[PDB]
């Protein structure tokens, strides 16, 4: 019945003491934290407490959207030889550090995901040419479907893949996705392998990457400029923002203390010193 | 009245019993006692195998030695018990398995010794590798040492042999071996074996995973990390030594998808 926005417990007035009750003494060996309040060790007055933990609920903690990737495009001289103008990015949060660290305080989670796309564009070589407002196609290709080969092949027809056609200069695009994990919760960490190497098999055949599984294979986002080729080159960037909504999390963990290095828990040499210098007897 | 104490305990599972006269109570991780899979949460459809007393009993792993230079030790579950009696067998014969555990770490000394060991049970204890050229590259063999377990280290030493990489973990102690500060490990279910106080740690761990049941041969649910918070010291001796012994008992373990026996490449 205790809601996130409820006021915390009041401080009760307490006077002097002289007894066998020993709140101050404890034993951390048990693995328990001593549940003391001021009144257990000092004399206190009565205080009607008004503060609440409303801003620290799990929901409110991850209430901010965060960048994940910067997808880009490019036009050459003419065709010359090139016609592979389209960006394909493997959907994974583990590309940045900011959102990634926040999602590591916990071992598992479940959440509906809101994605917002901010698209910006610009010119390259100084020219008197003018491009007409562009339309972009952001296509979610779930694991399995055929990935676009040419900028203008069949795959772009999208008869089953969800796609967002964004017109430049309008409010950034946004969509919601339900909890889509193949498990009861997403696993921020996976202590294991995808393949068991068998003795009667070759090492190569039984090999896999430590900590990797399809638990987190969500597919890819393929983005292209719908408009045909223009004489003047325009470069475009799509920033993706993820906001985990309706979230639940399990098993707390210590937050990452040294710089991230790859999609795993690995660390790089020379980044292992998070603490600075400070004397034991200096305030 | 009768003299019952938090310090004196007796644990009985299957045909095994452990007694202790210097305990510091015991921990039930996340307040959840191990349990069998409920119908409402079930997944695989075939009738599961529940070994009960055949597997739910205390197995004692090989004893290690604590000295002034010990950096720490680690084990994986169910990995460590992979070769333990019927538990091991039931594990290899089935595609799926789930199990809780009662981990009891033992280490006695004297009223004249000193030191403190942090015994931590970490869900999904992924450890960092040893390469600065490849990520997530530790091999299955090295990732699963079995009953002997592995050890933490005080210095990160990158593997430079790109011809034949060692492909092993290089877990740095203060980093809990996974890039997080040790001082925070206390967020995980744990106990501390402080010589002046107690001589054992008892952690009852429930089955914890993102799924109801999973492959035991591929994935380790829990990880046991033992590191010396305070170093070993005795009298005025330069090289004291005291042994540390682990005894682990699977609890409420059930298995599905029986087939022929999995014969893993362990070396």
């Amino acid at each position, epitope marked *: 019945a205790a809601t996130s926005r409820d006021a915390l417990p009041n401080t009760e007035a307490s006077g002097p003491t002289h007894s066998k009750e020993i709140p101050a003494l404890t034993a951390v060996e048990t693995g328990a934290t001593n549940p003391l309040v001021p009144s257990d060790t000092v004399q206190t007055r009565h205080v009607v407490q008004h503060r609440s933990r409303s801003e620290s609920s799990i929901e409110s903690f991850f209430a901010r959207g965060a960048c994940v*990737t*910067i*997808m*880009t*495009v*490019d036009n*050459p001289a003419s065709t010359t*030889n*090139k016609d*592979k*103008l*389209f*960006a*394909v*990015w*493997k959907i994974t949060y583990k*590309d940045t550090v900011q959102l990634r660290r926040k999602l590591e305080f916990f071992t598992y989670s479940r959440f509906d995901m809101e994605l917002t796309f901010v698209v910006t564009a610009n010119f390259t070589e100084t020219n008197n040419g003018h491009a007409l407002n562009q339309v972009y196609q952001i296509m979610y290709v779930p694991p399995g479907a055929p*990935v676009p*080969e040419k900028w203008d092949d069949y795959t772009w027809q999208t008869s089953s893949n969800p796609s967002i056609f964004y017109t430049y200069g309008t409010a950034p695009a946004r969509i919601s996705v339900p909890y889509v994990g193949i498990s009861n919760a997403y696993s921020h960490f996976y202590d294991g392998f995808s393949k068991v190497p068998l003795k009667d098999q070759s090492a190569a055949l039984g090999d896999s*990457l430590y900590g990797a599984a399809s638990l987190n294979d969500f597919g*890819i986002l393929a983005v292209r400029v719908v408009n045909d080729h223009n004489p003047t080159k325009v470069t475009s960037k799509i920033r993706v923002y993820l906001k985990p909504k309706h979230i639940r999390v399990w098993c707390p963990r210590p937050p990452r203390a040294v710089a*991230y*290095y*790859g999609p795993g828990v690995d660390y*790089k040499d020379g980044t292992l010193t998070p603490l600075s210098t400070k004397d034991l007897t200096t305030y | 009245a009768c003299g019952y104490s938090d310090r004196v305990l007796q644990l009985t599972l299957g045909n095994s019993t452990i007694t202790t006269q210097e305990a510091a109570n015991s921990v039930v991780a996340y307040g959840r006692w191990p349990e069998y899979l409920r119908d409402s949460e079930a997944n695989p459809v075939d009738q599961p195998t529940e070994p009960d007393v055949a597997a739910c009993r205390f197995y004692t792993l090989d004893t290690v030695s604590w000295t002034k230079e010990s950096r720490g030790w680690w084990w994986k579950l169910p990995d460590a018990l992979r070769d333990m009696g019927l538990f091991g067998q039931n594990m290899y014969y089935h595609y799926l398995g789930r199990s809780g555990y009662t981990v009891h770490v033992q280490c006695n000394a004297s009223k004249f010794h000193q030191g403190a060991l942090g015994v931590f049970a970490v869900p999904e204890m992924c450890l960092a590798g040893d*390469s*600065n*050229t*490849t*990520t*997530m*590259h530790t091999s299955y063999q090295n990732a699963n040492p079995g009953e002997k377990g592995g050890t933490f280290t005080g210095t990160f030493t990158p593997d430079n042999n*790109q011809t034949s990489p060692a492909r092993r973990f290089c877990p740095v102690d203060y980093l809990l071996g996974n890039g997080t500060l040790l001082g925070n490990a206390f967020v995980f279910p744990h106990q501390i074996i402080n010589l002046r106080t107690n001589n054992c740690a008892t952690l009852v761990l429930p089955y914890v995973n993102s799924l109801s049941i999973d492959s035991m041969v591929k994935h380790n649910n829990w990880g046991i990390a033992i590191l010396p918070l305070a170093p070993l010291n005795f009298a005025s001796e330069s090289s004291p030594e005291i042994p540390i012994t682990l005894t682990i008992a699977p609890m409420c373990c059930e298995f599905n998808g029986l087939r022929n026996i999995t014969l893993p490449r362990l070396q």
Partner: nanobody
Amino acid sequence: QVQLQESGGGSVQAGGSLRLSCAASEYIPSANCMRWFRQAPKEREWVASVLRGGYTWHADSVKGRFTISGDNAKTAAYLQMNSLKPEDTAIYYCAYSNTCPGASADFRSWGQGTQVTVSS
């Protein structure tokens, strides 16, 4: 700084085969899309692009003959050159990217390359 090293080049007769390799000095925690390029006169040409795994793209000249793989762990890529033609003679290069399945001669650094000479 960041270093890529090409290897495996040489001189072979037409119809032959080669395998080029490009590894990074140390691991790069950003570069996941690798590419191959070549050149002979005064103009660069894109060969093939390969992201993590296993999406692989090719060009209208090297497709079917060339194949790119690369480890999904170690930041390195490989180019298997089959049914080689005297037209393939050029200096081959390697360059890391970000999330760029597409290809364009627009890379910051440039390693050194590896010469491939195809005899008639």
